[PDB]
Design a protein around this ligand. Sequence first.
Ligand SMILES: CCC[C@@]1(CCc2ccccc2)CC(O)=C([C@H](CC)c2cccc(NS(=O)(=O)c3ccc(C(F)(F)F)cn3)c2)C(=O)O1
Lengths: 99, 99
Amino acid sequence: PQITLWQRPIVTIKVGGQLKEALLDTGADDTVLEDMELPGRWKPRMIGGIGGFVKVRQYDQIPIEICGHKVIGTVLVGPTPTNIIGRNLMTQLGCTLNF
Amino acid sequence: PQITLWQRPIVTIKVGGQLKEALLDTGADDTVLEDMELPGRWKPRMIGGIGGFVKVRQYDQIPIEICGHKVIGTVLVGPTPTNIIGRNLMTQLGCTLNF
Ligand SMILES: CCC[C@@]1(CCc2ccccc2)CC(O)=C([C@H](CC)c2cccc(NS(=O)(=O)c3ccc(C(F)(F)F)cn3)c2)C(=O)O1
């Protein structure tokens, strides 16, 4: 699709069988999700946002459907104002910024 | 332009007579710049993101030139770790996400 920015660019994602809303965020290097159960082992990571740093759990090679497109990549789980889709997964979508 | 997302989408801006680099962030409601002087009255605000909340000064109707295009909007200033251009200005550039 083509998504304008007059409202938050929120899309429906499917992760671990669950439908969720997530924000397409070109300012985010990584994908950060609200607390949920994910399979496999996790590794520690610290990420920086406008408010400072947060400790997150890093899970690798997690499949997510974003608007019906299947992507598979790293997801970080921790305290966040909302589910955030970052550039790591937007590049798998072939997503670009256009003006 | 069409900007891919393999790297951070960073652009040159001119604001309050200062030239700076800033990150195009589709996930940010608002534009938030590192602490600086801007003309006019301001109001204090607390804005939330990853890492928590940041105290900012809100300036209204500030002209910013982004990649040569003049836009006008509210500009927040405070101790953000990076200059961020939010949706409030990206819309004025006609910027869309496409996949
Ligand atoms: C995953 C980290 C993401 C990011 C990284 C910033 C960065 C980049 C390079 C180097 C250092 C730091 C980008 C980002 O959009 C935000 C948040 C939204 C998730 C953000 C950015 C700008 C302003 C705000 N405050 S706000 O009032 O405009 C706002 C509040 C909430 C949301 C919501 F959609 F996320 F809920 C969006 N905007 C928040 C952030 O806090 O850090």
